[PDB]
């Protein structure tokens, strides 16, 4: 997260870290056994780390649980990042408490101008690299479809939206992928892609979670 703030320990209790000997993507806990992340974050043998703030220090509220299953959207395309969504099943159910909690799925799609909370442990610089120990947060609005398409001609599908600030300085970045975009208490987006980070006229692009609610529920039911 570039241009954000320190969230505060366990203030985003649905945020998870996907770890392979190091943090590489975020995710969102949607029930005690399932996490939503980005398809491009897929790798075998992931450890999900819940209840984190400082990802480099044991502070007492962590739960580390192996992924037992990974379900990438059947129509994911790595070339275009269309359908950039994955479901992860935990090997054992997380113990839900004040620091480890599920985020609700949408009942309808969000609109342009709605303020959302984007969070993660990704890069805090747009030039060079500076990675935080503690969770960072950013308030950002959803952009109009037309502004999103103008920013990224030919690359925005109906399963994506743009959020952020066209003047630059505030955005998600490498290491935030898979993490949440929450609007009015609903998980509306997944961090996906962008040109650079926090660059003028190049907002963040996010998977449009509302398109996938029936697929998510069907997948949880059958796995």
């Amino acid at each position: 997260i570039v241009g954000g703030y320190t969230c505060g320990a366990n203030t985003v209790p649905y945020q998870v870290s996907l770890n392979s000997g190091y943090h590489f993507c975020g995710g969102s806990l949607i029930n005690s056994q399932w996490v939503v992340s980005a398809a491009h974050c897929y790798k075998s043998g992931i450890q999900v780390r819940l209840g984190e703030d400082n990802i480099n220090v044991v502070e007492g509220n962590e739960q580390f649980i192996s992924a037992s299953k990974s379900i990438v959207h059947p129509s994911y395309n790595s070339n275009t990042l269309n359908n950039d969504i994955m479901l992860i099943k935990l090997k054992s159910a997380a113990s839900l408490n004040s620091r480890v909690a599920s985020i609700s799925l949408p009942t309808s799609c969000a609109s342009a101008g709605t303020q959302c909370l984007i969070s993660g442990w990704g890069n805090t610089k747009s030039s060079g690299t500076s990675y935080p120990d503690v969770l960072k947060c950013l308030k950002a609005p959803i952009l109009s479809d037309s502004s999103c398409k103008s920013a990224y001609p030919g690359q925005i599908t109906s399963n994506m939206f743009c959020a952020g600030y066209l003047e630059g300085g505030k955005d998600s970045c490498q290491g935030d992928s898979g993490g949440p975009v929450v609007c009015s208490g609903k998980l509306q987006g997944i961090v996906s892609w962008g040109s650079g980070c926090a660059q003028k006229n190049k907002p963040g692009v996010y998977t449009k979670v509302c398109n996938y609610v029936s697929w998510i529920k069907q997948t949880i039911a059958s796995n």
Binding site: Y22, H23, F24, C25, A38, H40, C41, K43, N79, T80, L81, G122, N123, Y131, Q155, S172, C173, Q174, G175, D176, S177, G178, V191, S192, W193, G194, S195, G196, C197, G204
Partner: peptide, 12 residues
């Protein structure tokens, strides 16, 4: 296209 995995999508 530039995905936002760490350290990068290509660096895997």
């Amino acid at each position: 296209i530039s995905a936002r995995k760490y350290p990068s999508d290509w660096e895997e």
